[PDB]
Design a protein around this ligand. Structure first.
Ligand SMILES: CC(C)CN(C[C@@H](O)[C@H](Cc1ccccc1)NC(=O)O[C@H]1CO[C@H]2OCC[C@H]21)S(=O)(=O)c1ccc(N)cc1
Lengths: 99, 99
């Protein structure tokens, strides 16, 4: 599909059996998902943006479906105000920015 | 151009006379640039990102060239970790996400 940018580029994702809304974010290196009790081993991480840093849990090889496209990779879980699909998974669903 | 997302989507911009590197950021509503000298009037504002809120100077109707494409619009100037081109200007240059 083609997504114009008049509005936030939100899509439906499925992660750990739950449907969520997430922002397709070319400015994010990594995918960051709102706090949820996913199973699996993790490593702590700090990620920084406007305002400073948040502490997150880094999970590797997590399966996510994004707007119907399957993906698998690193997902950071923590107190983000929005769910963000970053470049690590955008590349897997074939996303490009065009102008 | 068509921009893939293996690497950060960095471009050269010209703003208030000066060349800077900036990140094309579909997850940003607004364009936020590091502290710099711009001429003319500004309004104090706040904006929040992943780590909290910062104070910025809002400049309106600023002429800004983005990878050779013209835009004229609002720029927030303040202590951002990365210069980001948000949707307010991405729409002006005709950017879309495609997958
Ligand atoms: C600042 C960027 C270099 C990186 N950010 C992604 C960015 O797209 C965020 C993504 C974002 C979106 C909403 C809320 C928080 C963070 N947007 C953002 O800060 O935009 C601000 C400017 O416009 C406003 O519109 C949204 C918030 C304001 S980030 O959220 O801080 C971030 C950093 C590291 C990772 N792995 C993932 C995300």
């Amino acid at each position: 599909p083609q997504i114009t940018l008049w509005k936030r580029p939100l899509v439906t994702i499925r992660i750990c059996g739950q449907l969520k809304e997430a922002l397709l974010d070319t400015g994010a290196d990594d995918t960051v998902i709102e706090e949820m009790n996913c199973p699996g081993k993790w490593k702590p991480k700090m990620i920084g943006g406007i305002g400073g840093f948040i502490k997150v849990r880094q999970y590797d090889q997590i399966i996510i479906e994004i707007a119907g496209h399957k993906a698998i990779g690193t997902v950071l879980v923590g107190p983000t105000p929005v769910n963000i699909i970053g470049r690590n998974l955008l590349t897997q669903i074939g996303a490009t920015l065009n102008f």
